[PDB]
Amino acid sequence: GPLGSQLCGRVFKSGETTYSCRDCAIDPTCVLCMDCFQDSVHKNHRYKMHTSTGGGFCDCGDTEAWKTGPFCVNHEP
Ligand SMILES: [Zn+2]
Numbered sequence: 001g002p003l004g005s006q007l008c009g010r011v012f013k014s015g016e017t018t019y020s021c022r023d024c025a026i027d028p029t030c031v032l033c034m035d036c037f038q039d040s041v042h043k044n045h046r047y048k049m050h051t052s053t054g055g056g057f058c059d060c061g062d063t064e065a066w067k068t069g070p071f072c073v074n075h076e077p
């Protein structure tokens with residue numbers, strides 16, 4: 001990204017698919033949007049899909065939310 005790494009920040013729409021990583025999330029509310037999940041190490045981990053009721057946002061790039069792989073390949077520095 002232009003300044004280095006990027007925070008995804010995608011705000012989910014109601015019904016949008018989201019993913020947590022049971023291995024890497026610091027807590028079960030840490031999630032990823034579909035693009036970040038598919039473009040991340042967590043696609044090969046023990047993930048758990050949850051449908052959003054809307055609002056809340058992707059935690060990709062939050063360097064304190066993930067025990068491994070805090071950035072997908074799109075958002076990494
Ligand atoms: Zn994202």
Ligand SMILES: [Zn+2]
Nearest residue numbers: 036060072075
């Ligand atoms: Zn990302």
Ligand SMILES: [Zn+2]
Nearest residue numbers: 021024042045
């Ligand atoms: Zn993971």
